[PDB]
Amino acid sequence: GLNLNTPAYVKNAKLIAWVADMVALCKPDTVYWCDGSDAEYQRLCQQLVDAGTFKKLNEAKRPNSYLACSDPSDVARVEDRTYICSAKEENAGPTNNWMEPSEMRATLQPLFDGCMRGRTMYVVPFSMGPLGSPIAHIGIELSDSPYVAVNMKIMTRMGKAVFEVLGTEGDFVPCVHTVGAPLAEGEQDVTWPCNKTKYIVHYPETREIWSYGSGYGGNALLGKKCFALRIASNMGRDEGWLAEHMLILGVTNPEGKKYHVAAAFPSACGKTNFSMLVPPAGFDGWSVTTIGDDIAWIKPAADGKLYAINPEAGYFGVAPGTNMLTNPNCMLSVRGNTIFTNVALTDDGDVWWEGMEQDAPGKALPDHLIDWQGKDWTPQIAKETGAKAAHPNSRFTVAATNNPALDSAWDDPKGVAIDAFIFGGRRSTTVPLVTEARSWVEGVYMAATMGSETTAAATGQAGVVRRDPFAMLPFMGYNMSDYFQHWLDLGKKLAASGATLPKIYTTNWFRKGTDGKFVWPGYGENMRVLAWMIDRIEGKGQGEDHVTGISPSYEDLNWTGLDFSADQFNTVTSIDKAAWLKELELHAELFKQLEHHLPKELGETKAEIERRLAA
Ligand SMILES: Nc1nc2c(ncn2[C@@H]2O[C@H](COP(=O)(O)OP(=O)(O)O)[C@@H](O)[C@H]2O)c(=O)[nH]1
Ligand SMILES: [Mg+2]
Ligand SMILES: [Mn+2]
Numbered sequence: 001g002l003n004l005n006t007p008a009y010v011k012n013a014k015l016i017a018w019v020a021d022m023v024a025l026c027k028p029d030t031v032y033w034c035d036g037s038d039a040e041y042q043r044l045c046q047q048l049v050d051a052g053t054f055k056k057l058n059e060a061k062r063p064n065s066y067l068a069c070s071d072p073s074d075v076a077r078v079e080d081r082t083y084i085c086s087a088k089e090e091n092a093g094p095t096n097n098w099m100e101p102s103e104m105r106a107t108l109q110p111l112f113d114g115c116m117r118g119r120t121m122y123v124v125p126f127s128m129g130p131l132g133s134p135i136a137h138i139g140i141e142l143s144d145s146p147y148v149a150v151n152m153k154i155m156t157r158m159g160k161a162v163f164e165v166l167g168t169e170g171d172f173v174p175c176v177h178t179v180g181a182p183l184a185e186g187e188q189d190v191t192w193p194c195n196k197t198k199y200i201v202h203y204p205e206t207r208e209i210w211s212y213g214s215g216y217g218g219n220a221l222l223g224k225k226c227f228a229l230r231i232a233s234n235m236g237r238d239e240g241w242l243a244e245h246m247l248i249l250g251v252t253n254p255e256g257k258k259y260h261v262a263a264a265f266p267s268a269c270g271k272t273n274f275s276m277l278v279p280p281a282g283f284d285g286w287s288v289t290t291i292g293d294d295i296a297w298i299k300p301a302a303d304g305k306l307y308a309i310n311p312e313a314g315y316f317g318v319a320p321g322t323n324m325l326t327n328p329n330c331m332l333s334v335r336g337n338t339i340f341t342n343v344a345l346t347d348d349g350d351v352w353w354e355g356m357e358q359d360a361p362g363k364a365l366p367d368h369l370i371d372w373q374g375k376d377w378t379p380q381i382a383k384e385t386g387a388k389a390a391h392p393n394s395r396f397t398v399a400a401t402n403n404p405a406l407d408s409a410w411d412d413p414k415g416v417a418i419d420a421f422i423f424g425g426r427r428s429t430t431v432p433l434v435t436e437a438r439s440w441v442e443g444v445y446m447a448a449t450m451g452s453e454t455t456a457a458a459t460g461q462a463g464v465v466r467r468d469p470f471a472m473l474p475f476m477g478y479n480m481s482d483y484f485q486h487w488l489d490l491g492k493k494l495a496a497s498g499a500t501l502p503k504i505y506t507t508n509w510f511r512k513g514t515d516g517k518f519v520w521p522g523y524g525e526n527m528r529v530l531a532w533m534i535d536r537i538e539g540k541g542q543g544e545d546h547v548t549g550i551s552p553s554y555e556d557l558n559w560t561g562l563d564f565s566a567d568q569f570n571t572v573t574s575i576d577k578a579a580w581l582k583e584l585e586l587h588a589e590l591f592k593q594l595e596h597h598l599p600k601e602l603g604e605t606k607a608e609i610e611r612r613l614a615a
Contacts, residue, residue, distance in 0.1 A: 002027075004016065005030075007163075012172075014169075022121075022176055026116040026142070026144070027115075029120060032120050032121070035160040036125075036158040047146055053147055055345065057340075062335070063337065065338045067340045070192045070194070073196055074194040075456075076393045076459050077459070078458070079459075080459075082201075083201045085101045085204075093476070093478065095476055096480075112212065117182040118184060122144070124152045125158065125162035126140075126157060127161075128156060142177065144178050145193075145220065147215055152221060154314040154339070155312055156223050175208075175209040175222035175223070179194050180197065180213040194215055197212070198213035204477060209227060209231065218457070229244075233475070236486075237486055240299065240300070240493075241299035242486070242487075243298075244296045246294075246308075247272070247293045248308050249275050253286055253534060254285030259419040261419060261530070263424070264424075264470055264471040265471055266452045268318050268455035268457040272318065272330065273326060276330060277327075277527060278405075280527055280561055282560030290400075290405050292310025292312060294312060300494055306502060309413060314397060314398055315397070315403070318395060319396050320388075320390050323356055325358055329403055332404050333402040334398050336402075339397040340394070340396050341396075342393070347367075352369055352390070353389065369389045372389070392456035393456040420504070420505060420533055421502055422533075424450070424505075424507035424509070426452045428510060429511065430582075430583050432508060432573045433551075435505065435546075437506070438545075438550065440504065444488055445602055446504060446506045446548070447487070448470070450471070479597060481598045484598070506548070528562070531558055532556055541556060547580060548580070554566045554569045554570075584609060591603065
């Protein structure tokens with residue numbers, strides 16, 4: 001068998017045997033074990049620069065940073081090619097793509113057979129959660145992409161320290177990734193190898209993850225969505241914990257009281273910006289700190305509280321829109337040591353994306369850029385054709401420790417107690433700015449039925465409203481109706497301790513006016529909504545009862561520093577009967593599709609809302 005070049009510190013025979021089997025299938029030219037060091041990261045980056053995948057950015061403008069641009073077919077998640085191959089189709093459910101496991105194995109085996117000819121297999125060891133902690137899980141990703149390897153260094157705890165935890169007998173999550181572009185002897189490679197044919201396949205009974213054809217982070221960083229949401233949610237269902245598509249933030253008010261909240265918004269619908277927001281004018285003495293921006297693992301304790309940890313080590317965030325007004329903590333985070341993907345290149349060797357002009361002299365566009373497709377770009381081109389310099393789903397990858405607002409407990413394996421949950425989709429109509437659920441069951445109803453307009457984070461037509469329960473439509477690892485029951489059962493467990501349950505809120509930053517612009521300013525001004533939630537948590541905030549829950553009056557929010565009138569507030573908080581009647585019919589369609597194992601409590605809650613609308 002091919003020489004594995006196994007390091008001496010790898011003491012795990014079952015792991016080595018699995019690598020041997022995967023090398024025999026994928027047939028790479030050579031095998032490299034990533035140790036996760038800083039020196040190795042620099043060498044792999046230089047390798048990417050030599051291949052043309054990376055351009056090194058100007059050291060004076062953007063220290064130790066790189067720019068990659070991808071094939072236009074490989075810019076986002078591909079939901080139609082993502083599968084949960086559970087033993088029974090009913091354990092995948094209507095929200096997932098299913099295929100009989102033996103039939104998927106026969107589909108993928110010829111694809112992976114020889115997939116890495118002409119390439120190096122990188123062995124990427126990683127821990128999700130702090131290394132060696134009771135809540136952490138170890139994975140091994142085999143990849144033929146050094147781009148995956150360097151991004152995994154930032155997004156996970158990667159490298160040789162993992163094998164100390166694994167030891168001789170520890171188990172691991174097996175992850176296989178190929179760009180699906182084997183190379184003949186003497187064949188010229190492309191700068192972004194990929195395949196038009198893609199599969200991202202999960203086998204829950206074995207915890208196997210197979211990814212073919214994509215180098216895009218959401219499809220190829222297999223610890224992130226594939227393990228820490230899809231596989232982990234199935235483990236949590238069996239073991240009494242949750243894996244959620246949620247940010248976690250800490251907020252401290254001027255009296256020094258600190259609270260933590262977890263918020264589920266769909267991909268590209270505001271989590272990163274909320275998780276590190278800066279309190280605006282009017283909020284002297286408040287502070288917001290970031291635990292995580294994307295994935296949360298949550299379990300109840302005997303004290304009746306819910307404890308959350310962020311299993312990731314970095315941010316893989318949407319770049320367009322980011323500037324010093326919308327997200328200054330992010331702007332400071334990506335000052336250096338960052339990987340940018342599909343943004344534009346300036347004449348001085350820096351990066352640019354739509355939105356950065358708001359910090360520019362005269363708030364003007366740059367005179368010339370090279371766009372993410374390598375084409376010349378100018379403001380005249382932008383004005384005449386609308387060409388985007390940066391792709392709408394362009395990304396930065398940066399270590400969490402670069403964030404000035406990083407919470408001191410961001411990597412504490414004891415977790416933080418969650419005082420409130422927030423759910424919210426991208427909705428141009430119908431949904432008010434903020435609503436508090438009257439009960440846990442009503443809150444689960446709000447999360448189960450939320451809708452959101454599709455975004456550039458996945459392929460397909462953007463701007464289309466769809467149901468996205470708990471912001472987990474692309475990431476739920478088992479039947480969505482059993483997941484609803486899991487949340488209902490968890491609340492009952494918490495209540496039996498005598499505790500007061502965390503409140504559940506719906507939010508909507510994204511109501512549009514007649515010209516299609518946003519009526520609510522959002523970004524830092526979302527602090528004004530968060531401050532109301534804190535008041536409610538403390539039992540000091542007022543609210544008015546309406547059809548879907550409790551909402552603040554104008555006078556219940558702090559408007560110091562923001563010119564936003566009572567009339568503008570009425571627009572984004574009014575409950576419109578006709579719009580909610582239509583919305584409830586869309587809930588009925590979801591419940592029809594999810595009839596199997598649908599908790600009866602959801603139909604009962606829907607019937608009460610219908611009464612309140614006909615009252
Ligand atoms: N209008 C508006 N846009 C926002 C807000 N928060 C984020 N965005 C934009 O929505 C896109 C995705 O935001 P991000 O925070 O990265 O969302 P995430 O993918 O859920 O982490 C970016 O273009 C942001 O500039 C907001 O409160 N209002
Ligand atoms: Mg994000
Ligand atoms: Mn996400």
